[model samples]
Target: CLESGTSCIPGAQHNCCSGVCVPIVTIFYGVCY
Candidate 1:
């Protein structure tokens, strides 16, 4: 990676690296089941 100690979200994962910033996702159970 070019640098480290960065911050990013979903769409930004494109350039994400090990030491660089990355994205995270979360999901829960469905509603009105």
Candidate 2:
């Protein structure tokens, strides 16, 4: 699983190690916070 601050898709929660993926913009990019 990905760690905090790792880039991921907003809806792809499985990519995060702990928290859910949050977008920085309105596109398909985000980070695990």
Candidate 3:
């Protein structure tokens, strides 16, 4: 999974959290919230 950019990216160079990619976010309810 980590070796081949199958789920995410080969070299995204972007910030991701627990397979969830994002920068600015807020906790509204749950999951990606």
Candidate 4:
């Protein structure tokens, strides 16, 4: 996965190497019953 170097949020950064806009986020859910 493309990660941001020397950044606060690595997962929030796009592919700087490829210079392509990308969305980095994991899909998760908390059980609320």
- Candidate whose TM-score is highest: 2
The TM-score between candidate 3 and the true structure equals 0.17
Model 3 per-residue lDDT tens digits across residues 1-33: 222222333235433354443223332212211
User: Candidate 4: where is the Cα deviation over 4 Å?
Assistant: 1-15, 24-33
10 residues in a row with least lDDT, candidate 3 = 24-33
TM-score of each: 0.20, 0.66, 0.17, 0.20
lDDT of 1 by residue, 1-33 (tens): 323433444333334355333333322211110
List candidate 2 stretches off by more than 4 Å.
Answer: none
Candidate 2 lDDT score relative to the true structure: 0.76
Error of 3 at 18 (Å): 9.6
**Candidate 4, residue 26: how far the Cα is off, in Å:** 13
Candidate 3: regions farther than 4 A off = 1-6, 14-33
Superior by lDDT: candidate 1 or candidate 4? 1
Tens-digit lDDT string for candidate 4 (1-33): 433431223334433554443323421211111
| Model 1 TM-score relative to the real fold | 0.20
| Sort by TM-score, top down from the best | 2, 1, 4, 3
- Of the two candidates 1 and 3, the one with more favorable TM-score, higher being better, is 1
Worst 10 residues of 2 by lDDT: 10-19
lDDT of 3: 0.31
Whole-model lDDT, model 1: 0.33
RMSD of every candidate to native, in Å, equals 11.6, 1.8, 10.1, 11.4
Local lDDT at 17 for model 1: 51
